[PDB]
Each structure stands twice: as C-alpha cells, then as structure tokens.
Amino acid sequence: LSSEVITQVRSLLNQGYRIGTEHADKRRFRTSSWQPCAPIQSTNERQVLSELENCLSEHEGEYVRLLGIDTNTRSRVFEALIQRPD
C-alpha cells in the first residue's frame, strides 16, 4: 500500500465510512465492468489495511478501485482508482 492510499483510507475510516473494493481485468475495466470483492467487515484501521492488501494480492495484474460507503444512506460518497495492472 502507498502512503497516499493509506492516508485516504484513514480519512475515510475517521469519518465512519465503510470500505469496499471492486476488481476487473483490463478488458472488463474498459467496458466499465467491475466485480464484487470479498467483504472487509472491520472498522479497525489495521485489519482494513491488511484485508485490502490481501485483496490486492488476490487480484494481481487487474484494476482495483477503492470506494467510500455511507452505510446509513446506502450510497456511494467517494471513487478512486487504487491499482492498475502494470
């Protein structure tokens, strides 16, 4: 994980926002086709960060996009493209 993503997820968690991730290959990515990733059911920063890095490792060489979720509103509040295949 990069410093700038770490500081992002920090800010996200501090507000009380949940964490989600979505993955897709370079073709899927082109077609704006994302897929669900395994749940990060933890509000602790360490556990979130560890599960993010595990998910990144899971999907080597595929686009990964990080997001911010307000559970009360059930709606998106932030978009961000964290990783790319190269």
Binding site: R27, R28, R30, T31, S33
Partner: protein, 101 residues
C-alpha cells in the same frame, strides 16, 4: 471471375499451415471461433450457415481443421468461412474464407 471476399482474399489461397497459424492467433486472443458455409456469397446477404455451433471449449486448431475438412466433405461446392468474435468488445474481430468450391 475477378470475385474476391472480405478478408485476406487478395493473398494466395490460405493453406493449412497458414490456416493453423491464423487459428492459433485467434485462440490466444480468446475469441470463441465460429465456422460458416453457403452455396453462394453475397455482400448484401448478411448471414451464412454456421457449422452447427460455434466452438467455445476450444484448445487446438487441429479440431477446427477437422471440422472445416468435414464441412468440405459435405459442402465441397460451397464456401467455408471462419469467424472470430470478442464478447467483451462486442465486435466480430475475425472473418475469413477457408474454402472455395
């Protein structure tokens, strides 16, 4: 007479080796093949007769060759085409004759 066709027609009649090379590129491209035949060939006529399915669980060219040779044996007076299609792209990426009567 001077009758050509869509793709690779102006090169020498494509031969089993070069068919194999082209089939291989099609395979590693990941586009699941389709073969197709007819009695005649009309541009204004969009659709030909596919070879009873498209091939989806394709590992080797040599099976595609066997099928083409079969569909010659049944339709030796018809034209046989190979077509390749990207789903993700939603674009027909390959379409070239492999037989003439």
């Amino acid at each position: 007479k001077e009758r050509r066709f869509e793709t690779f027609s102006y090169l020498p009649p494509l031969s089993d080796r070069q068919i194999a090379a082209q089939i291989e590129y099609m395979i590693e491209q990941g586009f699941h093949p389709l073969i197709e035949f007819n009695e005649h060939s009309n541009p204004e006529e969009f659709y030909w007769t596919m070879w009873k399915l498209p091939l989806f669980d394709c590992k080797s060219p040599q099976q595609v060759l066997d099928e083409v040779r079969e569909c010659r044996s049944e339709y030796g007076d018809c034209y046989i085409r190979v077509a390749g299609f990207d789903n993700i792209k939603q674009c027909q990426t390959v379409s070239f004759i492999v037989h003439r009567p």
